[PDB]
């Protein structure tokens, strides 16, 4: 949805043409030559490209841009290591935090929530409801007892009888 300027980028490339390699551009243990490099760091930081030009443009524009961002990234991080460069604060986003806090972490919390509420659906709750349903099947007179008497009447029926039908299944055994 965003776009860029190409002769900004070619003027950028011939700006970087006369600059030193990044292995000595900061090894000088000042702003005669270290004030033009922090400009270049700040130009690395801002987004030249958007996504609509990525798809519909050809390839040597892309190669131009790729070595541009390679040399610019080099000038940013080597200046950050030796020394915008000359400031100290904490608001910063590294490259992975966009899709690990906003995609990985909510998907993992989603996984937690799906496991917690999927644990309602299990065989022990269903099996206690089925055993209750079976003793209410055989003895419906427990139906018209009041509510907390019903609990213990069910329990005494469970103690008084099998209510499985497991020997029903093993007919070839019997």
């Amino acid at each position: 949805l965003r776009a860029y300027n190409e002769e900004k980028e070619l003027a950028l490339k011939q700006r970087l043409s006369q600059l030193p390699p990044p292995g000595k551009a900061f090894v000088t243990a000042k702003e005669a030559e270290l004030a033009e490099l922090a400009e270049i760091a700040a130009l690395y930081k801002t987004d030249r490209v958007g996504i609509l030009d990525i798809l519909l443009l050809g390839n040597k524009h892309a190669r131009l841009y790729r070595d541009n961002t390679a040399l610019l990234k080099d000038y940013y991080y080597n200046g950050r290591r030796i020394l915008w460069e000359i400031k100290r604060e904490g608001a910063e986003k590294e490259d992975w935090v966009n899709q690990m806090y906003f995609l990985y972490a909510p998907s993992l919390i989603l996984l937690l929530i799906v496991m917690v509420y999927k644990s309602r659906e299990d065989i022990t709750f269903w099996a206690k409801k089925e055993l209750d349903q079976r003793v209410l099947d055989k003895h419906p007179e427990i139906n018209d007892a009041p509510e907390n008497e019903r609990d213990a009447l069910i329990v005494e029926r469970i103690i008084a009888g099998d209510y499985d039908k497991l020997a029903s299944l093993q007919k070839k055994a019997t």
Binding site: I113, V114, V116, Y117, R120, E121
Partner: protein, 55 residues
């Protein structure tokens, strides 16, 4: 007098905000489903559980 001081620190650090917000949201959501279960007979998340029948 007494103990020597060190510089001031804000209370609500970013990790305090993140961990407190996520766990309070999870407890609030659990209580919301226990609220919704009594009214409608089923959880709000099992609305979204659509597996095929066993047969």
């Amino acid at each position: 007098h007494g103990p020597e001081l060190t510089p001031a620190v804000p209370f609500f650090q970013p990790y305090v905000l993140k961990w407190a917000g996520v766990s309070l949201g999870l407890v609030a959501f659990y209580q919301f489903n226990s609220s919704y279960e009594a009214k409608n007979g089923h959880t709000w998340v099992e609305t979204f559980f659509h597996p095929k029948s066993r047969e």
